[PDB]
């Protein structure tokens, strides 16, 4: 099952450079596609939480990049410029085995603010 997520300038509540949804919950063997619904984004991983020895995602600026879903886990992606500012995505994938290690990685700011919000959401 393919899974979307928008690269935005602001969501309708207001929320500045956000990916739409930041947080969702996936199967293996499904994709999940960043879109550039606005420009001047993009979506790679963050490696220092990204698990290991699964393949990283680099997408290039402004354009389309796929995750493909394979190993169970949670997975944690910025957009490069605006990661500061709070554009950070978490897509987890089947059990959330990693867990204790995401809420471990520290961010600052805006993206601690908002990695912790989707954190929250992970289903268990
Ligand atoms: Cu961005």
Same mark, same amino acid.
């Given at each position: @099952?393919? #899974?979307?997520?928008?690269?935005?300038?602001?969501? *309708?509540?207001?929320?500045?450079?956000?990916?739409?949804? &930041?947080?969702?919950?996936?199967?293996?063997?499904?994709?999940?596609?960043?879109? %550039?619904?606005?420009?001047?984004?993009?979506?790679?991983?963050?490696?220092?939480?990204?698990?290991? &020895?699964? @393949? %990283?995602?680099?997408?290039?600026?402004?354009?389309?990049?796929?995750?493909? @879903?394979?190993?169970?886990?949670?997975?944690?992606?910025?957009?490069?410029? #605006?990661?500061?500012?709070?554009?950070?995505?978490?897509?987890?994938? &089947?059990?959330?085995?990693?867990?204790?290690?995401?809420?471990?990685?520290?961010?600052?700011?805006? @993206?601690?603010?908002?990695? *912790?919000?989707?954190?929250?959401?992970?289903?268990?």
């Amino acid at each position: @099952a393919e #899974h979307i997520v928008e690269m935005r300038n602001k969501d *309708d509540a207001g929320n500045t450079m956000v990916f739409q949804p &930041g947080f969702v919950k996936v199967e293996a063997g499904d994709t999940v596609k960043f879109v %550039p619904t606005d420009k001047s984004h993009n979506a790679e991983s963050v490696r220092e939480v990204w698990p290991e &020895g699964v @393949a %990283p995602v680099k997408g290039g600026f402004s354009k389309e990049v796929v995750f493909n @879903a394979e190993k169970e886990g949670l997975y944690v992606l910025k957009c490069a410029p #605006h990661y500061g500012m709070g554009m950070v995505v978490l897509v987890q994938v &089947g059990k959330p085995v990693n867990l204790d290690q995401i809420k471990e990685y520290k961010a600052t700011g805006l @993206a601690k603010k908002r990695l *912790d919000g989707e954190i929250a959401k992970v289903v268990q």
